[PDB]
Ligand binder design. Structure first.
Ligand SMILES: C[As](C)(=O)[O-]
Ligand SMILES: [Ca+2]
Ligand SMILES: [Ca+2]
Ligand SMILES: [Ca+2]
Ligand SMILES: [Ca+2]
Ligand SMILES: [Cl-]
Ligand SMILES: [Cl-]
Ligand SMILES: [Cl-]
Ligand SMILES: [Cl-]
Ligand SMILES: [Zn+2]
Ligand SMILES: [Zn+2]
Ligand SMILES: [Zn+2]
Ligand SMILES: [Zn+2]
Lengths: 93, 89
């Protein structure tokens, strides 16, 4: 049996693999792959920046693809934004 | 509606609040609280480091607790490790 934290991380892994297995290297999310990822998995405040802008920022080692480690940058920024908004809703700030 | 990615993040947030709401400042996880988190939410290869060792690593500003930002360090390291180990055995 897995813990909720373990199942959450495996879910994030499955989301990445969903788009990394589309073509080419199995641990590479290419520009067009990331576009479909943003439109399907991400909310509007993430989408508005566009796939081209996100791809350029996420491609840390500049190899023309997004690996899982680079993908976590997007995941964490979403997590922070989600937590920040929920914190601002519980408190009438 | 919520995407699979959004739900996973909410679960992670819920996991942190589960231990931060125990006592004192509700936005802070203390040493005993972290030990509880590690023993309940984390796999063996993560636990083997030690609760005291993990706490010193996570409490980077040394205010005596792990806040949400510091907690994400653990989440990131666990995520990388889980992915790496999922492609083994
Ligand atoms: C609802 As809260 C513990 O993020 O202030
Ligand atoms: Ca690929
Ligand atoms: Ca890259
Ligand atoms: Ca607390
Ligand atoms: Ca701290
Ligand atoms: Cl950005
Ligand atoms: Cl609170
Ligand atoms: Cl908090
Ligand atoms: Cl592999
Ligand atoms: Zn919080
Ligand atoms: Zn609060
Ligand atoms: Zn506040
Ligand atoms: Zn993988």
């Amino acid at each position: 049996a897995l813990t909720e934290l373990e199942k959450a991380l495996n879910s994030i892994i499955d989301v990445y693999h969903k788009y990394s297995l589309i073509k080419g290297n199995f641990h590479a999310v290419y520009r067009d792959d990331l576009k479909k990822l943003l439109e399907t998995e991400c909310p509007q405040y993430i989408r508005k920046k566009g796939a081209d802008v996100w791809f350029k920022e996420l491609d840390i080692n500049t190899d023309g693809a997004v690996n899982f480690q680079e993908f976590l940058i997007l995941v964490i920024k979403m997590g922070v934004a989600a937590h920040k908004k929920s914190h601002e809703e519980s408190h009438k700030e």
